[PDB]
Amino acid sequence: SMMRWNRERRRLQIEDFEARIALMPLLQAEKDRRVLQMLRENLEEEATIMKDVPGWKVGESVFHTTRWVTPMMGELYGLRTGEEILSSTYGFIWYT
Amino acid sequence: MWFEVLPGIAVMGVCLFIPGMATARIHRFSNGGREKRVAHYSYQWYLMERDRRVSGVNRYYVSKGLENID
Amino acid sequence: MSLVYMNIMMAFTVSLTGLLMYRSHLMSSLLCLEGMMLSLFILATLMILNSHFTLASMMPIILLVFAACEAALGLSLLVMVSNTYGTDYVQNLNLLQC
Amino acid sequence: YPTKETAHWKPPPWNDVDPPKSNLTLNFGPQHPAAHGVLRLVMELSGEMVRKCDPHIGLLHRGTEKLIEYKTYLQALPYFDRLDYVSMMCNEQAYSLAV
Amino acid sequence: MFMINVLTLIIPILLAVAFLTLVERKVLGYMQFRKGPNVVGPYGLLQPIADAIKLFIKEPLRPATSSISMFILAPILALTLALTMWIPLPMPYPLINMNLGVLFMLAMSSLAVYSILWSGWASNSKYALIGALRAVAQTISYEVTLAIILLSVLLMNGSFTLSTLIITQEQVWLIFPAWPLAMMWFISTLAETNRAPFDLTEGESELVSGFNVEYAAGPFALFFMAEYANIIMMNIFTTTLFLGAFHNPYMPELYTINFTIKSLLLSITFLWIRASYPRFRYDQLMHLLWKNFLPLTLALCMWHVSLPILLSSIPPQT
Amino acid sequence: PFFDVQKKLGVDLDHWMTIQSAEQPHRIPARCHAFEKEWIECAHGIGSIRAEKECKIEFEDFRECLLRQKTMKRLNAIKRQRDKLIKEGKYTPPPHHSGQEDLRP
Amino acid sequence: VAAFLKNVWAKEPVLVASFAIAGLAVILPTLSPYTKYSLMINRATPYNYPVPLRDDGNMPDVPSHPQDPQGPSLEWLKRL
Amino acid sequence: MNLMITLLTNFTLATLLVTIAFWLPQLNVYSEKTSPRLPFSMKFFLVAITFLLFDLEIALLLPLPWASQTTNLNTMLTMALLLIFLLAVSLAYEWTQKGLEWTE
Amino acid sequence: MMTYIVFILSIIFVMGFVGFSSKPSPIYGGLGLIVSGGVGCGIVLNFGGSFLGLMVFLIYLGGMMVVFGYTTAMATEQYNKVVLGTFITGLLMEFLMVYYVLKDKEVEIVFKFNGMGDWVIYDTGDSGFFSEEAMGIAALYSYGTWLVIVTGWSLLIGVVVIMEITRGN
Amino acid sequence: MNPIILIIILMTVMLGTIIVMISTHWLLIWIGFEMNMLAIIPIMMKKHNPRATEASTKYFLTQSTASMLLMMAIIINLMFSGQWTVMKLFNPMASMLMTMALAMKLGMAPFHFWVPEVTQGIPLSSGLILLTWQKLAPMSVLYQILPSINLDLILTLSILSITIGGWGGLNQTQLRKIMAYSSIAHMGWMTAVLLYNPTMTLLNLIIYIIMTSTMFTLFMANSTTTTLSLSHTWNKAPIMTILVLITLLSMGGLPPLSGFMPKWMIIQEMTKNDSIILPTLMAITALLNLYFYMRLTYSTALTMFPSTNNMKMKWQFPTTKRMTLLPTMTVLSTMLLPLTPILSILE
Numbered sequence A: 001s002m003m004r005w006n007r008e009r010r011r012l013q014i015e016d017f018e019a020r021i022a023l024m025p026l027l028q029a030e031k032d033r034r035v036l037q038m039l040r041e042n043l044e045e046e047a048t049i050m051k052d053v054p055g056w057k058v059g060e061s062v063f064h065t066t067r068w069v070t071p072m073m074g075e076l077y078g079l080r081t082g083e084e085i086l087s088s089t090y091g092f093i094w095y096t
Numbered sequence B: 001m002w003f004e005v006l007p008g009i010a011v012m013g014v015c016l017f018i019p020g021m022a023t024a025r026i027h028r029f030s031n032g033g034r035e036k037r038v039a040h041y042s043y044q045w046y047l048m049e050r051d052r053r054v055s056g057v058n059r060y061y062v063s064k065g066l067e068n069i070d
Numbered sequence C: 001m002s003l004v005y006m007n008i009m010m011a012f013t014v015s016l017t018g019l020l021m022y023r024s025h026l027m028s029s030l031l032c033l034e035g036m037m038l039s040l041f042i043l044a045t046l047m048i049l050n051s052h053f054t055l056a057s058m059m060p061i062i063l064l065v066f067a068a069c070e071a072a073l074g075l076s077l078l079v080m081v082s083n084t085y086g087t088d089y090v091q092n093l094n095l096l097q098c
Numbered sequence D: 001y002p003t004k005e006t007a008h009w010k011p012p013p014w015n016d017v018d019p020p021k022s023n024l025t026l027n028f029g030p031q032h033p034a035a036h037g038v039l040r041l042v043m044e045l046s047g048e049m050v051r052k053c054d055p056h057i058g059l060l061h062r063g064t065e066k067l068i069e070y071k072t073y074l075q076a077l078p079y080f081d082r083l084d085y086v087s088m089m090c091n092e093q094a095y096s097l098a099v
Numbered sequence E: 001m002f003m004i005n006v007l008t009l010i011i012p013i014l015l016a017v018a019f020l021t022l023v024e025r026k027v028l029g030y031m032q033f034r035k036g037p038n039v040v041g042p043y044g045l046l047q048p049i050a051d052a053i054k055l056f057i058k059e060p061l062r063p064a065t066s067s068i069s070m071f072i073l074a075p076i077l078a079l080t081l082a083l084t085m086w087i088p089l090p091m092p093y094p095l096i097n098m099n100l101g102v103l104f105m106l107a108m109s110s111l112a113v114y115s116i117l118w119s120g121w122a123s124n125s126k127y128a129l130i131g132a133l134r135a136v137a138q139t140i141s142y143e144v145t146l147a148i149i150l151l152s153v154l155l156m157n158g159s160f161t162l163s164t165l166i167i168t169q170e171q172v173w174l175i176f177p178a179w180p181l182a183m184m185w186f187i188s189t190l191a192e193t194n195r196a197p198f199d200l201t202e203g204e205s206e207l208v209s210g211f212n213v214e215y216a217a218g219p220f221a222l223f224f225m226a227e228y229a230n231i232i233m234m235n236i237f238t239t240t241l242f243l244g245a246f247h248n249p250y251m252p253e254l255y256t257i258n259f260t261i262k263s264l265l266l267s268i269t270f271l272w273i274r275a276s277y278p279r280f281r282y283d284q285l286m287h288l289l290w291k292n293f294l295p296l297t298l299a300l301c302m303w304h305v306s307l308p309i310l311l312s313s314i315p316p317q318t
Numbered sequence F: 001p002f003f004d005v006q007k008k009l010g011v012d013l014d015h016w017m018t019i020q021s022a023e024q025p026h027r028i029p030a031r032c033h034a035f036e037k038e039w040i041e042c043a044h045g046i047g048s049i050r051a052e053k054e055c056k057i058e059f060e061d062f063r064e065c066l067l068r069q070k071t072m073k074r075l076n077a078i079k080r081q082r083d084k085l086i087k088e089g090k091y092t093p094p095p096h097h098s099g100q101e102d103l104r105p
Numbered sequence G: 001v002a003a004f005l006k007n008v009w010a011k012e013p014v015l016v017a018s019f020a021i022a023g024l025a026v027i028l029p030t031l032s033p034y035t036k037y038s039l040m041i042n043r044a045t046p047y048n049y050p051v052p053l054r055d056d057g058n059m060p061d062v063p064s065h066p067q068d069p070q071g072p073s074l075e076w077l078k079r080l
Numbered sequence H: 001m002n003l004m005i006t007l008l009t010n011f012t013l014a015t016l017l018v019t020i021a022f023w024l025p026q027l028n029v030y031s032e033k034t035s036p037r038l039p040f041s042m043k044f045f046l047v048a049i050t051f052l053l054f055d056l057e058i059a060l061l062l063p064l065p066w067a068s069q070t071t072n073l074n075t076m077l078t079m080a081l082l083l084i085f086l087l088a089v090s091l092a093y094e095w096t097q098k099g100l101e102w103t104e
Numbered sequence I: 001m002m003t004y005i006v007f008i009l010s011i012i013f014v015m016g017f018v019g020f021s022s023k024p025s026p027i028y029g030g031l032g033l034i035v036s037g038g039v040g041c042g043i044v045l046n047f048g049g050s051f052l053g054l055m056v057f058l059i060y061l062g063g064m065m066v067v068f069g070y071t072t073a074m075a076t077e078q079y080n081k082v083v084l085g086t087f088i089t090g091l092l093m094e095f096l097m098v099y100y101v102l103k104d105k106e107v108e109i110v111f112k113f114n115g116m117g118d119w120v121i122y123d124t125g126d127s128g129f130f131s132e133e134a135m136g137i138a139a140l141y142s143y144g145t146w147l148v149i150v151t152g153w154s155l156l157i158g159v160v161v162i163m164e165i166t167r168g169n
Numbered sequence J: 001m002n003p004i005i006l007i008i009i010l011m012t013v014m015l016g017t018i019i020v021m022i023s024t025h026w027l028l029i030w031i032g033f034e035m036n037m038l039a040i041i042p043i044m045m046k047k048h049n050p051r052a053t054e055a056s057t058k059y060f061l062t063q064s065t066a067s068m069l070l071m072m073a074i075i076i077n078l079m080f081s082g083q084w085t086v087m088k089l090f091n092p093m094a095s096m097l098m099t100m101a102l103a104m105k106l107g108m109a110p111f112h113f114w115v116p117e118v119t120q121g122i123p124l125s126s127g128l129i130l131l132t133w134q135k136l137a138p139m140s141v142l143y144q145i146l147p148s149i150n151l152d153l154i155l156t157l158s159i160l161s162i163t164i165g166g167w168g169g170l171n172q173t174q175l176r177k178i179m180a181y182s183s184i185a186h187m188g189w190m191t192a193v194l195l196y197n198p199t200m201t202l203l204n205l206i207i208y209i210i211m212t213s214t215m216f217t218l219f220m221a222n223s224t225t226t227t228l229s230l231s232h233t234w235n236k237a238p239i240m241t242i243l244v245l246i247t248l249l250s251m252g253g254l255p256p257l258s259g260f261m262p263k264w265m266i267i268q269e270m271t272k273n274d275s276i277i278l279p280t281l282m283a284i285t286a287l288l289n290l291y292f293y294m295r296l297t298y299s300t301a302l303t304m305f306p307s308t309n310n311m312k313m314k315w316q317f318p319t320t321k322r323m324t325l326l327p328t329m330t331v332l333s334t335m336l337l338p339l340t341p342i343l344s345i346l347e
């Protein structure tokens, strides 16, 4: 009974994983536009904040490479409110 | 005779029935008449937070179907 | 760097200086030694989860297993010392001055 | 070079074996006093094993067979019901057969 | 809204622990050709209330303690662990649905020996300390076969999630592939909670439970109710892990009634074991662990590793 | 005495856990996979003395990927100037930085 | 060898059952016909995204669509 | 978060019941009741250390339900049977040198 | 405040280490190391090391501190100025560290440390239908063959070693 | 101890040292040190007297402290480099911690304070293992981390080791304490030349292992643990007094003996790097080592201390002890100086 049922459960797991596979391009495009939206907002607010600071380059990347670095949590949610911060940064861990 | 033990076992069984039925009704109450979303893995949490973002009322259980698109 | 790394390092130095300053007992020394191991466990785990380096997730378990076998060996030495002298006091371990 | 401080030191043993420089004695009785309840046992445990068992008795000594001396044979019959108080008529029968 | 759910877990725990005393005394009555309580309430229903009010106004015993702080912390830790063992239990939906619920319960049951050890520390007796070390050694001994039988069972589950263990047992009860693990599990959980025939501190085979000696104990009611929370909890856990009921996601109370009836039968099976056997000698249950349960546990652990590979029945990860 | 038995016999005893860019289970990348790959492919074969001076830029990028000290310093500067401008009353946060804008997807 | 086996099954049945179960656990996956399918199910479980290849012009074994005939198939898993 | 609330609730209920069990029988002011190293066993320490080392071997054995999902099943099955075999060899050596004696 | 929860638990961790390192007795030292292991387990659990935190509670606090309290009961009698003085010294040094790093958002004890909470350094992605830490621990058997060989051999040797040296013959 | 269990435990000691030698990962280095300590503890407790329990407890405490500092250095290396390769360290604090940890595992001064106590507490065979075989794994790690070792730290440790190991044996009559202070001074000689030419470090390690193995094998073959019990060797087996004479004159660094070879090659490689004061102070401080060696040779071979009458019964019995490789180790520890350019095989 466990042989038949775990083979059927592996088939169901592969079905769920193929649903995940089929959905991942849309979610990846949404995630790309998500992080680029948040970084462009942070950049425009850096420009409108960091004017009184002498010798501040807005948008200066701290890496010598010009390669796209994955945005850090503080780079995206650093200027936002602490509710959204906690909901992004401990929401999965603290979920039940 | 032996059935005299049954009121105590019945009270103990009601006291064991209350937590499970209670948490089932509470999970149906706080989630729009449905099961609580089980997010054991980060993909399930990403889908759940995507639901929270697309519902507009900061609640993941507000399901939006074909009526939300044109 | 990260702020919690300062605290875990300072906890290691606290249990270091406690292990490096005996009061009376040998069990207190082994407790400070395993507190040092605990801070090593926490700090290694925070680095490895911080970097998403997958293969080293088995490293803190190996640290835990080897140093808890080390703790068992030290407790056995403490048992033999306390059976010899009656107490686990470190001032009874003084016959190697001559 | 013996100094002021390093003068109380002795040479070590030749075989490097030092002298070592006893077991538990329990005072023991039955847990719930219903069946026996009147027993004192002075144990000498060796961890788990029992080395010496010393039952201290006389806790229910009533002086029965001195009280028998001052009563007649019929009056001393009910003293035998209370010696082995779960074997009453057997002790009655033994005293009866003696008389 | 969640605090209401926490209270509707933890207060019926205390009520079921109160009436397990009544169920035990009545069932041990009728199994001994006599009755349990029927005078104090109608059919005995006021006996736990009378007994709890009797215990809660009883004087602290005779002595003082060696350590006041641990004398306070040992009932706190016993009750806290005995209440936190319920929160991942899928009944059919757990209170705290965590991914590692089995491992959480194994860890929080491993922590339960500190109440025994600290209550042995707090008493002024050097003999109560020896008895506490005997009880701690017994409990940590059977924790080994708890861990390994638990691992061997979860090799047929796929994860440490307790909620997956309802999905695992939809086609068959898991006692049918693993009844030797189930019987060694049931006796090992019996030996965890110091339950007869393994209750050596509560009865004889004991250096310290010996008619008029020292050792301040704590309040008896709190240790007792932590023990019976542990008993009902391990019977619910054994029910969930071997006798899994049918779950309908539209009518969950079918599962709740079903596993409740099975858990009541299993706690009555505890009551029916304790009214049937003499106690082991201390080294005899040490023998029963180390030379009997643990070699079979390692052998069946090898079998339940190698068996989903030889049958092509490895359960899914998620 | 680095008796390199693993290369003499051709066994993989501990080379796999050594770096973050190695073969991982289920193809999981680290958070600094690309930076470490760049620093390793820079410093490979040239020796440690030439790697201290000729791979300084890749190693500084990789250390700053690991510890994020320049990144957290820059975020400290931006957040401290932001709180100073809230203190002076010369700035107000936009509605996309207050939680009242109904996030993207 | 059968007198000693009956002797140890009479004296110590727990240890005989232990060594017998452990012996089956050791030797039996090398003799099972289904040990191959364990590997075949574990490697055919898609935990990651099937990152496609740039079509250079000569890859006849790689499909262009999931419903194409060529490519790896799981009819053996549906049937068994 | 809900777990931390639940842990704090369980700790609070436990502490409240401990406070009731210590202070409520101090209301009824009773009479003032004025009337008026440990022996070492090596076997207790050896059962504690045998527990500790077998628990470390269990700590090695715990990721087996996750290890069964691997693609390297020959190596995984070999090292799984090898760890349980080394736990059994530790138990056999604990047997034959009289380690499991008088607490068997 | 709640964004600083790993920092708060790490300060409780350092306070507990200053507590038992003052060494009032091995009994209360063991209790302090138990409380410290619990809050350091909370630190591990708040980065996503759920299995490793349960390894704290199950192995460290579950077996090893049990064996330490077991041996403390059995090789020590059942339970100062120097203890409390070194305790308040360590507490004042740690609170001065907290005050400095919260007033400057920057400190240098031995290295430089940020003063914001450690939520800033987390990743902004997902791991799919698996945990990365769980699969890396599952890799102990598939990828970590030699590590299992040396660890199991060291445990076997450790059993042999403790049975030799506690025998007394 | 059971001979099978003795053989398995000695293979575990050797296996831990080999795991430190061959592995490329820092966790396997730490595992090798843990395996080495865990298996060498019963060798020290072979006779089960309270001095061995005291010595094994002190050895456990020092090696455990060193192993925890070693894992802390490895953890700070993983911080500042994100990797585990056994090579140079990517942080001077991790370099300081690992240099302290390896100096504790060697017993170099000022962490020398366990070496004469633990060496006196345990037998001569276990002391031979402790003073020869246990020096292999930390010197392998120091050979592997030398691009990051602080020079001032390692030279301070080296000269403090040489001076304290010189003044330590001048007050001693127990042979195991003399060999332990000799060990402290010679490990100072080895680590003084580490950042200049580690081939000469390996040369000094091999020559010191041969000479110490010779002296402990002579002490086991005569069953002498004090100076005054070593004095009666001329009336029992007079060839042994000749062998301890030539080996102690070797270990003092006297030409034409091969114990002059290591320190002469160390001076030869330190004067190349424009260090003149430091090998001068090292060579002048080696006269203290040679002084208590000459004290032993006066007590043993160059004069005849009075014996007792029960020696006449021991005249009637041969040495049945397995004097394993003692002529080989004797010839290698004295007459190897004409073969001095054989040091290139260690390059």
Ligand SMILES: CCCCCCCCCCCCCCCCCC(=O)OC[C@H](COP(=O)([O-])OCC[N+](C)(C)C)OC(=O)CCCCCCCCCCCCCCCCC
Pocket: E180, E182, E183, E184, E186, E187, E197, E238, E242, E273, E277, E288, E291, E292, E293, E296, G011, G012, G013, G014, G017, G020, G021
């Ligand atoms: C989970 C739901 C319930 C499950 C069932 C549990 C409820 C029933 C409980 C009954 C009352 C128990 C009260 C407490 C009893 C405590 C004593 C006790 O349990 O002692 C255990 C006894 C102890 O043995 P013993 O003490 O009787 O024997 C003497 C022992 N020597 C010789 C060493 C002195 O037995 C065991 O330990 C057995 C454990 C389970 C074994 C399972 C074996 C399965 C079959 C394997 C294969 C066999 C065929 C051969 C090979 C084939 C190969 C293909």
Ligand SMILES: CCCCCCCCCCCCCCCCCC(=O)OC[C@H](COP(=O)(O)OCCN)OC(=O)CCCCCCCCCCCCCCCCC
Pocket: B011, B014, B015, E015, E041, E042, E045, E046, E049
């Ligand atoms: C999850 C479910 C949990 C359920 C737990 C409880 C299970 C049992 C349910 C109730 C069973 C019946 C209880 C009967 C109680 C005894 C009543 C009684 O006999 O009282 C008599 C007593 C004296 O009366 P008197 O007036 O003097 O008589 C002279 C007559 N000529 O009069 C008095 O003493 C005064 C009146 C006392 C009334 C007490 C009633 C019972 C209280 C028990 C507590 C729990 C009740 C349930 C709570 C949950 C539901 C609300």
Ligand SMILES: CCCCCCCCCCCCCCCCCC(=O)OC[C@H](COP(=O)(O)OCCN)OC(=O)CCCCCCCCCCCCCCCCC
Pocket: A092, A093, A094, A095, A096, B039, B040, B041, E073, E076, E077, E080, E081, E084, E097, E098, E099, E100, E104, H001, H003, H004, H007, H011, I034, I035, I037, I038, I039, I041, I042, I043, I045, I046, I050, I053, I054, I061
């Ligand atoms: C003497 C002192 C007092 C003694 C009495 C009180 C203490 C003893 C009783 C309480 C024991 C507490 C145990 C708490 C940790 C349990 C492990 C755990 O948190 O597991 C649940 C979960 C992991 O499951 P998973 O599903 O993978 O993660 C969520 C992702 N969806 O992970 C999570 O959900 C993580 C949630 C956030 C992290 C919370 C961690 C707990 C808080 C810090 C420690 C507090 C207790 C300290 C002392 C403990 C005893 C030593």
Ligand SMILES: CCCCCCCCCCCCCCCCCC(=O)OC[C@H](COP(=O)(O)OCCN)OC(=O)CCCCCCCCCCCCCCCCC
Pocket: E294, E295, E296, E298, E299, G008, G012, G015, G016, G017, G018, G019, G020, G022, G023, G024, G026, H085, H088, H089, H091, H092, H095
């Ligand atoms: C190769 C397969 C895998 C093997 C490794 C995995 C084993 C898994 C189970 C773990 C067992 C751990 C403990 C083993 C200890 C063995 C030594 C032992 O117990 O010897 C003593 C015993 C006699 O017991 P005694 O000393 O009298 O104790 C008093 C109890 N009444 O002596 C005996 O009773 C004799 C015990 C040995 C004989 C048992 C034979 C069973 C044969 C079954 C059929 C063949 C199975 C296939 C494997 C080949 C076995 C040779």
Ligand SMILES: CCCCCCCCCCCCCCCCCC(=O)OC[C@H](COP(=O)(O)OCCN)OC(=O)CCCCCCCCCCCCCCCCC
Pocket: F001, J010, J125, J126, J128, J129, J132, J133, J136, J202, J205, J206, J209, J210, J213, J217, J220, J322, J323, J324, J325, J329
């Ligand atoms: C860069 C370098 C890399 C590495 C290169 C290789 C390094 C080799 C290092 C060798 C270290 C030797 C360690 C000590 C010996 C090990 C075996 C052992 O334990 O021997 C002692 C043994 C105990 O027997 P027992 O009966 O207890 O003796 C007391 C009397 N009843 O038996 C005895 O007591 C017997 C008495 C004589 C024992 C003599 C042993 C001599 C061993 C060393 C030989 C010389 C070193 C090898 C050549 C140079 C290599 C550098």
